Enzyme design. Structure first.
Site, PDB file in Angstrom:
ATOM      1  N   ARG A 150       1.759   5.054   5.380  1.00 56.93           N
ATOM      2  CA  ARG A 150       1.444   4.542   3.967  1.00 56.93           C
ATOM      3  C   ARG A 150       2.956   3.949   3.618  1.00 56.93           C
ATOM      4  O   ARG A 150       3.969   4.232   4.290  1.00 56.93           O
ATOM      5  CB  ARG A 150       1.474   5.884   3.333  1.00 56.93           C
ATOM      6  N   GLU A 172      13.322  -3.686   1.063  1.00 51.36           N
ATOM      7  CA  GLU A 172      13.542  -4.324  -0.132  1.00 51.36           C
ATOM      8  C   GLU A 172      11.879  -4.428  -0.605  1.00 51.36           C
ATOM      9  O   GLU A 172      11.153  -4.834   0.322  1.00 51.36           O
ATOM     10  CB  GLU A 172      13.867  -5.761  -0.084  1.00 51.36           C
ATOM     11  N   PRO A 228       7.565  -8.264  -4.682  1.00 49.90           N
ATOM     12  CA  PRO A 228       6.561  -7.917  -5.742  1.00 49.90           C
ATOM     13  C   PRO A 228       5.330  -8.905  -5.647  1.00 49.90           C
ATOM     14  O   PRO A 228       4.320  -8.575  -6.166  1.00 49.90           O
ATOM     15  CB  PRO A 228       7.064  -8.008  -7.035  1.00 49.90           C
ATOM     16  N   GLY A 229       5.415 -10.229  -5.096  1.00 51.08           N
ATOM     17  CA  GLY A 229       4.222 -10.930  -5.138  1.00 51.08           C
ATOM     18  C   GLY A 229       2.941 -11.107  -4.460  1.00 51.08           C
ATOM     19  O   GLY A 229       2.187 -11.654  -4.536  1.00 51.08           O
ATOM     20  N   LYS A 261       8.038   2.747   3.659  1.00 52.81           N
ATOM     21  CA  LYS A 261       6.997   3.161   4.469  1.00 52.81           C
ATOM     22  C   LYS A 261       7.330   4.419   5.315  1.00 52.81           C
ATOM     23  O   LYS A 261       8.457   4.887   5.780  1.00 52.81           O
ATOM     24  CB  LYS A 261       7.213   1.951   6.012  1.00 52.81           C
ATOM     25  N   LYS A 321      -0.297 -12.090  10.724  1.00 52.41           N
ATOM     26  CA  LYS A 321      -1.636 -12.237  10.197  1.00 52.41           C
ATOM     27  C   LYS A 321      -1.303 -12.162   8.590  1.00 52.41           C
ATOM     28  O   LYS A 321      -0.034 -11.888   8.193  1.00 52.41           O
ATOM     29  CB  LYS A 321      -2.565 -11.205  10.603  1.00 52.41           C
ATOM     30  N   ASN A 345       0.555  -9.239   6.592  1.00 53.47           N
ATOM     31  CA  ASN A 345       1.811  -8.794   7.029  1.00 53.47           C
ATOM     32  C   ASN A 345       3.144  -9.889   6.281  1.00 53.47           C
ATOM     33  O   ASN A 345       4.203  -9.714   6.720  1.00 53.47           O
ATOM     34  CB  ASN A 345       2.090  -8.778   8.452  1.00 53.47           C
ATOM     35  N   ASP A 373       2.139  -9.422  15.727  1.00 50.87           N
ATOM     36  CA  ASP A 373       1.175  -8.860  14.664  1.00 50.87           C
ATOM     37  C   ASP A 373       1.210  -9.990  13.306  1.00 50.87           C
ATOM     38  O   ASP A 373       0.988  -9.410  12.281  1.00 50.87           O
ATOM     39  CB  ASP A 373       1.690  -7.550  13.947  1.00 50.87           C
ATOM     40  N   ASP A 416       6.223  -5.982   8.160  1.00 46.86           N
ATOM     41  CA  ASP A 416       6.146  -5.112   9.142  1.00 46.86           C
ATOM     42  C   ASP A 416       6.393  -5.399  10.544  1.00 46.86           C
ATOM     43  O   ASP A 416       6.334  -6.626  10.933  1.00 46.86           O
ATOM     44  CB  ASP A 416       4.629  -4.825   9.188  1.00 46.86           C
ATOM     45  N   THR A 443      -4.197  -7.378  16.062  1.00 44.49           N
ATOM     46  CA  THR A 443      -5.168  -7.362  15.429  1.00 44.49           C
ATOM     47  C   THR A 443      -6.328  -8.185  16.095  1.00 44.49           C
ATOM     48  O   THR A 443      -5.945  -9.527  16.386  1.00 44.49           O
ATOM     49  CB  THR A 443      -4.835  -7.688  14.133  1.00 44.49           C
ATOM     50  N   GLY A 496      -0.316   0.902  -0.031  1.00 47.75           N
ATOM     51  CA  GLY A 496      -1.094   0.570   1.253  1.00 47.75           C
ATOM     52  C   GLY A 496      -1.133   1.869   2.055  1.00 47.75           C
ATOM     53  O   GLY A 496      -0.461   2.434   1.926  1.00 47.75           O
TER      54      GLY A 496
HETATM   55  C1  LIG Z   1       4.629  -3.869   0.245  1.00 49.16           C
HETATM   56  C2  LIG Z   1       3.597  -3.508   0.859  1.00 49.16           C
HETATM   57  C3  LIG Z   1       2.338  -3.399   0.394  1.00 49.16           C
HETATM   58  C4  LIG Z   1       1.395  -3.155   0.946  1.00 49.16           C
HETATM   59  C5  LIG Z   1       1.027  -3.207   2.341  1.00 49.16           C
HETATM   60  C6  LIG Z   1       2.181  -3.569   3.092  1.00 49.16           C
HETATM   61  N1  LIG Z   1       3.425  -3.783   2.342  1.00 49.16           N
HETATM   62  N2  LIG Z   1       2.540  -3.819   4.458  1.00 49.16           N
HETATM   63  C7  LIG Z   1       3.267  -4.745   4.834  1.00 49.16           C
HETATM   64  C8  LIG Z   1       1.711  -3.164   5.605  1.00 49.16           C
HETATM   65  C9  LIG Z   1       2.411  -3.062   6.831  1.00 49.16           C
HETATM   66  O1  LIG Z   1       3.384  -2.170   6.614  1.00 49.16           O
HETATM   67  C10 LIG Z   1       0.213  -3.975   5.642  1.00 49.16           C
HETATM   68  C11 LIG Z   1      -0.209  -4.780   4.557  1.00 49.16           C
HETATM   69  N3  LIG Z   1      -1.070  -3.935   3.479  1.00 49.16           N
HETATM   70  C12 LIG Z   1      -0.244  -2.917   3.004  1.00 49.16           C
END
Ligand SMILES: Cc1ccc2c(n1)N(C)[C@H](CO)CCNC2
Ligand SMILES: Cc1ccc2c(n1)N(C)[C@H](CO)CCNC2
Ligand SMILES: Cc1ccc2c(n1)N(C)[C@H](CO)CCNC2
Ligand SMILES: Cc1ccc2c(n1)N(C)[C@H](CO)CCNC2
EC number: 2.7.11.11
Length: 339
Positions: free
Chosen positions: A45, A110, A113-114, A61, A157, A160, A155, A173, A190, A40
Site C-alpha cells: 500500500r 518524497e 502531490p500532482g 510504501k 506505464k 508509475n 514497469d 515505483d 504489466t 493506493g
Molecule cells: C504517491 C502514490 C500514490 C498512489 C500510487 C502510487 N504512488 N504508486 C506509484 C504505485 C506504485 O507504488 C502505483 C500507482 N497507484 C498508486
C-alpha cells in the site's frame, strides 16, 4: 555544469556504485510519522504520512513481508530498496528513509502531490504531440541514466509516472527494477507494456524498456495503448504480431519513431542498436527538444497540476482505510536480513 554526456554518465556511475556497495538501512521508525491517507493499494500500500518533528510530508510504501514471500517477490523487494537508495537523477523520486519491523517493510519517499500521469491523461483524453514529447524526453534521459548503471526499469506505464509541482515527471515505483549484466528472465511488468521477448519467455535486456517507451508514447498521443484486449492472452497475441495501426492525426515523424521502438525484432529496435540512445535523441520527432534545458528543468511545462499545498491529496483517489498491524513476533526475518 557544462561537460560531455560521457563525463556526466561516468560520474553518475561512480556515485551510484558507492551507495550500491554500501546500502543505507534502518534510517527511521514507524512512530516517527503520523498517518494521513491511503493513496493506493495493491502485498503493499502507499500512504501519505507526515513526519512528526519536521512536518514534512512523505509517500510511505508498506509491504507485508508474509505476502512478499508467498508472491515470490523477495528479490524484487530487495532490488527496489537497494536501487532507490543508490540513484540520483532529476526525474527519479527520492527515497528519504527505509526500515522494517516485525511485520512490514517500509520505503519512505518524497510526496509528489500532482498525481499520476494516468489520471491527467484519462481526464483530458490525449496529449498533443508537444506535450507528449515533453514527458517522453524526460523518460529518454532517465533510461539513458538507468541503463548506463546497468539497471533495467521494467514497469514503465502512466500510473508509475507522477507529475510534480513544476509539471515535470517523477518516476516513482522501482518494484521490478534490477541490475543486469547481459540478460534476465523473470516474467514481470504489466501486460499492455510487455515486449514480445518477455511474453515468449526469452532472455531479455534493456531493449524491453525502449519497447515500453514506444507503448507509452503511443498511449499519450492516442489516448489508448496500441495493444489492448479483454484478456491478457489476447493482448499477448497482438503484441507478438506487432501489427500496429496509427491514428490519422499522428505526425509522420511520430509514426516513424513508433515503428522503430515497437520493433518486434529486438536486434533492430531503436535504443538497442550500435548508436544506442542517440538513435532516439537524434530522431526527427525530437528535433525541437533541448536536452540540456529539459535536464536542468528550465523548460516551462505544458501544464501544472492544481493542488493547494504539500499535503493536498485531491489528485489521488479514495480507498478503504485499513490498519497497519505490527505483530509482537518477527516474521520472515531471514528472507529480509539485507533490507
Ligand atoms: C504517491 C502514490 C500514490 C498512489 C500510487 C502510487 N504512488 N504508486 C506509484 C504505485 C506504485 O507504488 C502505483 C500507482 N497507484 C498508486
Ligand atoms: C533465490 C533467487 C535468486 C534469484 C532470483 C530469484 N530467487 N527469484 C525467485 C526472483 C523473484 O523474486 C526472480 C528470478 N530471478 C532472480
Ligand atoms: C546534449 C547534452 C550535452 C551534454 C550533457 C547533456 N546533454 N545532458 C542533458 C546530461 C544528461 O543527459 C546532463 C547535462 N550535461 C551533459
Ligand atoms: C489490528 C491488529 C493488530 C495487530 C495484529 C493484528 N491485527 N492481526 C489481526 C494479525 C493479522 O492476522 C495477527 C495478530 N498480530 C498482530
Amino acid at each position: 555544469e557544462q561537460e560531455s554526456v560521457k563525463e556526466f554518465l561516468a560520474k553518475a556511475k561512480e556515485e551510484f556504485l558507492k551507495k550500491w556497495e554500501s546500502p543505507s538501512q534502518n534510517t527511521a521508525q514507524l512512530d516517527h510519522f503520523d498517518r494521513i491517507k491511503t493513496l493506493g493499494t495493491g502485498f503493499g500500500r502507499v500512504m501519505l504520512v507526515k513526519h512528526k518533528e519536521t512536518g514534512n510530508h512523505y509517500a510511505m510504501k508498506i509491504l507485508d513481508k508474509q505476502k512478499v514471500v508467498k508472491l515470490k517477490q523477495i528479490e524484487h523487494t530487495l532490488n527496489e530498496k537497494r536501487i532507490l537508495q543508490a540513484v540520483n537523477f532529476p526525474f527519479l523520486v527520492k527515497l528519504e528513509f527505509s526500515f522494517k519491523d516485525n511485520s512490514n517493510l517500509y520505503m519512505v519517499m518524497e510526496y509528489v502531490p500532482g498525481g499520476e500521469m494516468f489520471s491527467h491523461l484519462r481526464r483530458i483524453g490525449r496529449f498533443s504531440e508537444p506535450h507528449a514529447r515533453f514527458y517522453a524526453a524526460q523518460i529518454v534521459l532517465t533510461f539513458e541514466y538507468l541503463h548506463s548503471l546497468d539497471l533495467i526499469y521494467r514497469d514503465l506505464k502512466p500510473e508509475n509516472l507522477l507529475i510534480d509541482q513544476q509539471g515535470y515527471i517523477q518516476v516513482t515505483d522501482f518494484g521490478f527494477a534490477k541490475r543486469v549484466k547481459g540478460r534476465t528472465w523473470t516474467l514481470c511488468g504489466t501486460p499492455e507494456y510487455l515486449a514480445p521477448e518477455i511474453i515468449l519467455s526469452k532472455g531479455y535486456n534493456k531493449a524491453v524498456d525502449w519497447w515500453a517507451l514506444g507503448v507509452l508514447i503511443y498511449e499519450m498521443a492516442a489516448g489508448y495503448p496500441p495493444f489492448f484486449a479483454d484478456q491478457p492472452i489476447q493482448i499477448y497475441e497482438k503484441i507478438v504480431s506487432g501489427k500496429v495501426r496509427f491514428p490519422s492525426h499522428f505526425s509522420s515523424d511520430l509514426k516513424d519513431l513508433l515503428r522503430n521502438l515497437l520493433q518486434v525484432d529486438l536486434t533492430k529496435r531503436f535504443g538497442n542498436l550500435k548508436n544506442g540512445v542517440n538513435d532516439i535523441k537524434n530522431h526527427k520527432w525530437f528535433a525541437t527538444t533541448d536536452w540540456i534545458a529539459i535536464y536542468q528543468r528550465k523548460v516551462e511545462a505544458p501544464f501544472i497540476p492544481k493542488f493547494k499545498g504539500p499535503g493536498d491529496t485531491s489528485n489521488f483517489d479514495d480507498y478503504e482505510e485499513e490498519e497497519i498491524r505490527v505483530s509482537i513476533n518477527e516474521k520472515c526475518g531471514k528472507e529480509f536480513t539485507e533490507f
